[PDB]
Design a protein around this nucleic acid. Structure first.
Lengths: 592, 147, 118, 78, 209
DNA sequence: GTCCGCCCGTTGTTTCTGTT
DNA sequence: AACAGAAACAACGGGCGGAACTATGCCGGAC
RNA sequence: UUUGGCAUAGUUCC
């Protein structure tokens, strides 16, 4: 009750303290509503100015006002956004045995043949050999497509967005032609195979006959052709759908018509479309997410508000907590102040008669078997922090020797005694002021362990299917594994990647400038797309991938990061009249 | 660097109508107090506080040079709105600023130094208490701190 | 860049203060060769600067005295010489060599207190 | 050799309809027998359906070239 | 430590072997795949006061299309490589009749040395790689799609097919990490092959400029 | 009818090493 | 010893939502 | 059947 938990409902009413606390709660909502609007409008305006003149040319390429290629095919496939639908691939997830049983078309049992295919067709199937060779080649092609799919889509996601809804088209064909599923059909599986092969030739995105053009078309229609073959497999047609001749012909005609209608029309203003599509969710939008994150990603800064670096471990460190904690120790910065307990500066010229009575025995043992200055620098190390990081006094001593050379002296006790003692002596320029500078440097500059600029490192098991490692078993399924993943504060990507027992493939940060300077421009494009997808989908919202790809390509087209500001807008070699209308009019005009 | 790293923290005062900052011991000496014992009587009320004494020590280490009211006033007045070409006028300007624009609410008469010193010592003492984590920092949105 | 600047300023300050503490003629301590009865392995080795043969002989006696005390408790020269030589081979600087010898002596005394042969 | 798409895009359809309607409204001959219609936009749509609009669309490739497609030759999608 | 230094030398050598294999030079499978113990045995498990002394690890290898065109991989023993070291290396290249060479640096090179490397560009080609930049292979990172260097013939054919002037392609800086990995000069065009979410594959092109 | 409140791209200043 | 290349810190300048509807005061002073 | 502007304040809608 003291900190504001309203026990009553709106029907019973609120006691005065709960009334005031509720008003304090609602004020925050009013403030956020009145605050987000201007920033959202400004972000949308900057995006529109950035991509206002990007168009789809009659060449089918996507070019800006200076005829510089942005995408060779819009959305990497050449289709329009408003004509595509969610669909499932249905050949990626099934195991080996299930996949073979569902897509093989056994022509040997012959009782399933008599039950599903007609009598005049079963004799043909059992007699011919060219038919059998074609039917085996079809399954070979499907297996190769399955492997390609598993490479393209790790983590086993079937859901995909493709232009023609094949299952609903099949349902419509069944209802239109009054197909009875309880009777054998008159569809020849060879007719099915030949029809699909001929159909795939009429779905042309890249027109040409050179090897380059044929390769471009294959890349442009690979996924849809894989889906088409998976759906119109002959065994699936014979078992599940049970179509007929005229039904199959109508289905092929409808597929051609819909694919041809779902192709992007030249002249579209895809740049402005993408700007609006990515900026309209902004008005409804321990790290930063939402409007500030979008602002940072659009105008890239070298100092993000909450830099982070998710780290994946390679082997037994991923499972066993021992090496996990060991890597956690290796990757976290730690100076001497993090472990020291207390320090003091004494005046003790006598090696034997020591002002401090604790060090007597071992300091005498050290001095008995051999100038120097009479002053001292006695420090005391906290036992809890000393033993937490698995540190050793010999390690601290050798680090001090490396850091200062042999112009210092160091004598240290061991963990046997309850008091762990380090004693330092030097082997204008007066001693006391020099020892205070030695202590101050040795406590804020020592860098015993860890990587500089890496402040704090967490260590927690993942709970999401994108931050988990997913493998493919020997039986072909997808199995999800839980392995320890780290999450640091502060970024230094190169050192963490170079560290022993750290996975150099899946390790990633969220600083775009760092990704650039370490991995190039294509990696920065992919990472920028992933960060934008994360910030957009945190709210559960959906935005078509074409708009994300267009924004990322526009930002990373010229080889260096182009922040969407006056700097990036005027860096383009465009006409002065486009730049004058944006964040700098008179200066640009007078320069030109 | 080595000397800044050893010093750590120093206490400075931004007097009005003065070009830039002034160390606090300089102002206290300009008020007419010479002995470190007297200045610490004005600032640290209970001398059995070694942490407070150590915190104020680097501020007193800036008194290694200045030791007299005349030179302290000269140092203060060197940074006026219009720096003078003479020295007596600069020293008179320094005294005028310390008598007219520094803490007007305590007093403006001739014998107000004995109380301006106490109030400035209280300001420094409260700053030390804030730095030691013994009192909560104020918030501007508290409505007892408004008119 | 600020950490690198502060580290350079510190290194210049430190080097200046240590040069004001370095005398004009650092007498290079003369390496006295081992005697004919020196039981040390690699006794003539000058690999560790400022580590004398007499220091290593003293360190070896500490190991012998510790091992002798341990054996008297549990009911030796060759073992002491191997312990010294291993410590010598692993050490780069005289102070760490001495510390690693004293650690071995402490470990032997711990084993003796626990009634265990080292 | 023409490589541009054989369909008439929505923008080409809109501009052709607007220009043909303006031409009709400026007292120009029609290429179809109007069965009672009087609105220039309706008559233009009827002509487009009949494939009798006498316009050739000049499509500019980005490399400076161009292609002339008659309305009769372009598949009318919508 | 000696173990860590051996590990760093081994990792640098392995990455350079992978780099040469990608650049088309002729590196065998056994050279490509060496275990840490095998490297310890072959060239010293003790670096400090041991056989591997950042020398004798230099690699001379011949391109698969021309045994006459060969490349060096030099390991300076100095944390700051200097003008005289660069002159020594250029003398060795001149005497061995070698055009291109790599130089792995402990910490860095002075700007004078870098400019003295740039000056002899038509005479000789030398590249600087830091010790930290080669402990990992940036190409193997999953964020980095496959890059293919395209011949002038492939470039011409591509430009003719799309009717593009080279100004109209996307660009990639000559200081890019992958560009330095492949050793690409200005005016060459790289090809990017990456999988796609909406098409299944997408081939882009970048101009080094 | 006459006079009188926060961020971050440029450019400078200064400094610190390398070559000959 | 003179010169030159590269870098740390400090100062300066431009940038900051979209529409719409009422009202009220003022546009130089002395001679 | 002809056309003032500058500033400030309040309000409506996302």
């Amino acid at each position: 009750e003291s900190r504001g938990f309203v026990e009553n409902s709106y029907l019973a009413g609120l006691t005065p303290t709960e009334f005031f606390f509720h008003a304090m709660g609602g004020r925050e909502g009013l403030i956020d509503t009145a605050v987000k609007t201007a920033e959202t409008g400004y972000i949308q305006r900057r995006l529109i100015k950035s991509m206002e003149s990007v168009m789809v040319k009659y060449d089918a390429t996507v070019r800006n006002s200076i005829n510089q290629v942005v995408q060779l095919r819009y959305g990497e496939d050449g289709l329009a956004g408003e004509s595509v639908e969610f669909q499932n691939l249905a050949t990626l997830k099934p195991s080996n045995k299930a996949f073979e049983k569902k897509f093989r078309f056994d022509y040997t049992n012959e009782r399933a043949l008599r039950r599903t295919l007609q009598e005049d067709l079963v004799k043909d199937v059992l007699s011919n050999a060219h038919i059998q060779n074609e039917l085996e080649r079809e399954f070979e092609r499907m297996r190769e497509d399955r492997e390609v799919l598993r490479v393209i889509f790790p983590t086993g996601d079937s859901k995909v967005v493709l232009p023609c809804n094949l299952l609903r088209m099949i349902w419509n064909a069944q209802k239109i032609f009054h197909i009875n599923p309880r009777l054998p059909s008159d569809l020849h599986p060879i007719k099915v195979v030949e029809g699909v092969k001929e159909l795939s030739k009429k779905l042309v995105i890249v027109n040409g006959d050179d090897p380059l053009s044929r390769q471009a078309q294959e890349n442009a229609t690979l996924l849809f052709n894989i889906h088409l073959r998976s759906t119109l497999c002959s065994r699936r047609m014979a078992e599940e759908f049970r179509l007929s001749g005229e039904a199959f012909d109508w289905l092929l005609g409808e597929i051609e018509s819909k694919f041809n209608q779902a192709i992007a029309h030249p002249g579209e203003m895809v740049g402005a479309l993408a700007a609006q599509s990515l900026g309209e969710p902004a008005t409804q939008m321990n790290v930063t997410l939402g409007v500030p994150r979008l602002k940072e990603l659009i105008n890239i800064s070298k100092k993000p508000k909450t830099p982070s670096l998710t780290v994946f471990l390679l082997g037994q460190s991923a499972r066993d907590a021992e090496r996990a904690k060991d890597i956690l120790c290796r990757l976290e910065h730690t100076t001497l102040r993090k472990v020291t307990a207390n320090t003091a500066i004494y005046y003790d010229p006598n090696p034997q008669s020591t002002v401090v009575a604790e060090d007597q025995e071992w300091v005498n043992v050290y001095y008995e078997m051999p100038r120097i200055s009479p002053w001292l620098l006695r420090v005391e190390l906290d036992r809890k922090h000393m033993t937490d990081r698995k540190l050793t006094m010999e390690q601290i001593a050798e680090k001090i020797n490396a850091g200062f050379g042999d112009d210092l002296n160091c004598i240290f006790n061991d963990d046997n005694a309850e008091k762990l003692v380090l004693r330092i002596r030097i082997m204008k320029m007066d001693d006391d002021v020099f020892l205070r500078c030695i202590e101050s440097n040795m406590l804020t500059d020592m860098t015993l362990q860890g990587i500089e600029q890496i402040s704090k490192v967490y260590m927690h098991l993942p709970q999401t299917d994108n931050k988990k490692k997913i493998i493919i078993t020997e039986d072909g399924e997808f199995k999800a594994l839980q392995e320890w993943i780290l999450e640091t504060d502060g970024v230094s990507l190169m050192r963490v990647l170079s560290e022993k027992d750290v996975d150099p493939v899946r390790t990633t940060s969220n600083d775009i400038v760092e990704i650039f300077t370490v991995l190039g421009i294509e990696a920065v494009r992919k990472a920028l797309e992933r960060e934008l997808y994360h910030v957009i989908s945190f709210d559960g919202s959906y935005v078509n991938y074409r708009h994300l790809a267009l924004l990322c390509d526009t930002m990373t087209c010229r080889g260096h990061l182009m922040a969407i500001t006056r700097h990036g807008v005027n860096r383009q070699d465009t006409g002065p009249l486009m730049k004058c209308s944006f964040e700098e009019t008179v200066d640009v005009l007078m320069e030109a | 660097g080595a000397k800044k790293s050893a010093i750590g923290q120093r206490i400075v005062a931004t007097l009005p109508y003065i070009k830039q900052e002034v160390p606090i011991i300089i102002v206290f000496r300009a008020l007419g107090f010479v002995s470190d014992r007297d200045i610490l009587e004005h600032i640290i009320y209970d001398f059995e506080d070694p942490e407070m004494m150590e915190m104020v020590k680097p501020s007193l280490d800036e008194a290694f040079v200045i030791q007299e009211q005349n030179v302290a006033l000269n140092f203060i007045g060197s940074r006026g709105a219009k720096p003078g070409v003479t020295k007596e006028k600069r020293i008179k300007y320094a005294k005028e600023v310390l008598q007219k624009e520094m803490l007007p609410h305590v007093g403006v008469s001739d014998f107000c130094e004995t109380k301006k010193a106490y109030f400035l010592g209280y300001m420094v003492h409260r700053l030390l208490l804030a730095a030691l984590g013994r009192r909560e920092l104020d918030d501007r949105d508290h409505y007892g701190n408004k008119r | 860049g600020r950490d690198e600047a502060h580290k350079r300023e510190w290194n210049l300050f430190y080097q200046k203060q240590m040069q004001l503490r370095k005398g004009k003629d650092p007498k290079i301590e003369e390496f006295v060769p081992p005697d004919e009865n020196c039981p040390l392995k690699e006794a003539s080795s000058r690999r560790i600067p400022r580590l004398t043969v007499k220091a290593r002989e003293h360190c070896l006696r500490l190991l012998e005295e510790a091992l002798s005390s341990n054996r008297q408790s549990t009911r030796l020269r060759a073992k002491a010489v191997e312990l010294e030589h291993e410590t010598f081979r692993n050490a780069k600087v005289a102070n760490l060599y001495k510390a690693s010898v004293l650690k071995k002596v402490a470990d032997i005394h711990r084993a003796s207190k626990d009634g265990q042969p080292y | 050799k023409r490589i541009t798409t054989p369909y008439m895009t929505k923008y080409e359809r809109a501009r052709v309809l607007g220009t043909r309607a303006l031409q009709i409204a400026m007292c120009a001959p029609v290429m179809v027998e109007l069965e009672g219609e009087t609105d220039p936009l309706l008559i233009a749509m009827k002509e487009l359906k009949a494939r009798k609009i006498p316009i050739i669309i000049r499509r500019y490739l980005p490399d400076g070239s161009y292609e002339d497609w008659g309305v009769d030759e372009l598949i009318i999608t919508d | 430590d000696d173990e860590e230094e051996t590990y760093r030398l081994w990792k640098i050598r392995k990455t350079i072997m992978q780099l040469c294999h990608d650049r088309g030079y002729l590196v065998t499978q056994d050279g490509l795949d060496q275990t840490l113990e095998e490297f310890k045995a072959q060239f010293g498990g003790k670096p400090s006061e041991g056989r591997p002394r950042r020398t004798d690890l230099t690699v001379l290898v011949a391109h698969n299309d021309d045994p006459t065109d060969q490349m060096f991989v030099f390991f300076p023993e100095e944390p700051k490589v200097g003008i005289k070291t660069i002159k020594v290396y250029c003398q060795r290249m001149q005497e061995e009749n070698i055009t291109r060479a790599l130089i792995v640096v402990q910490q860095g090179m002075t700007p004078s040395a870098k400019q003295s490397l740039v000056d002899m560009a038509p005479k000789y080609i030398l590249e600087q790689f830091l010790q930290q930049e080669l402990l990992i292979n940036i190409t193997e990172h999953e964020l980095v799609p496959e890059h293919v260097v395209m011949t002038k013939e492939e470039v011409t054919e591509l430009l003719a097919r799309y009717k593009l002037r080279e100004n109209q392609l996307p660009r990639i800086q000559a200081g890019d990490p992958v560009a330095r990995y492949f050793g690409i000069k200005r005016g060459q065009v790289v090809k990017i092959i990456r999988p796609s979410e909406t098409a299944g594959r997408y081939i882009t092109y970048r101009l080094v400029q």
